Design goal:
mainly beta; Thrombin, subunit H; seven-stranded antiparallel beta sheet; six-stranded antiparallel barrel; globular; binds calcium ion
């Protein structure tokens, strides 16, 4: 997260860290048994770290749970990072408490202008922001016109841009798979962008609201 601030500890209880020897992606707990992440964050097996704030220090609020199923969306296509969404099933249910709480899926899609929050332990591109401590950033959803203008013909029905065309504030490498919460529900998954916080290159996120049927279907299976 570039241009953001350190989140109040545990203010994003759905935020998880995907670990395979080190932190490589974010994710969002959507219930006691499932985590929503990006398909480009795929790995046959991953460690899901919940209840984290400082991923480098043991705080006692953590729960480390290994995945038992990792399912990339069937229409995921890496060449254009389309349908970049993935479900991770926990081998054992997470214990819901003060530090671990699921985020609700969207009842409907959020329109351009909606102010949301994105968080993660990714690159901060700043000597002041400590990526080891969960970073938070408020970003507004951009209009399709501005999104497509930034990346001509590269925006699909499964994507939306959020952030500032002026640069300085955006998600980044390491935040991938993480959440974009708008008014309490999960509208996006950190997916891609040219660089980070670069003028004219806003963040692109997987549009969670159109994946409800697949999400609920799969989690029941
Ligand atoms: Ca920790």
């Amino acid at each position: 997260i570039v241009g953001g601030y350190e989140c109040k500890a545990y203010s994003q209880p759905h935020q998880v860290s995907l670990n395979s020897g080190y932190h490589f992606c974010g994710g969002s707990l959507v219930n006691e048994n499932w985590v929503v992440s990006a398909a480009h964050c795929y790995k046959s097996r991953v460690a899901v770290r919940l209840g984290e704030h400082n991923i480098k220090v043991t705080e006692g609020s953590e729960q480390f749970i290994s995945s038992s199923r990792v399912i990339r969306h069937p229409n995921y296509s890496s060449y254009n990072i389309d349908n970049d969404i993935m479900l991770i099933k926990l081998s054992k249910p997470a214990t819901l408490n003060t530090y671990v709480q699921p985020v609700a899926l969207p009842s409907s899609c959020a329109p351009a202008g909606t102010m949301c929050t994105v968080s993660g332990w990714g690159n901060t591109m700043s000597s002041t922001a400590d990526g080891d401590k969960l970073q938070c950033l408020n970003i507004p959803i951009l209009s399709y016109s501005d999104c497509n203008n930034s990346y001509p013909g590269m925006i699909t029905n499964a994507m939306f841009c959020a952030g500032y065309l002026e640069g300085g504030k955006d998600s980044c490498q390491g935040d991938s798979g993480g959440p974009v919460v708008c008014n309490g529900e999960l509208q996006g998954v950190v997916s891609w962008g040219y660089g980070c916080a670069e003028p004219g290159n806003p963040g692109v996120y997987a549009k969670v609201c159109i994946f409800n049927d697949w999400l609920t279907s799969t989690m029941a299976t």
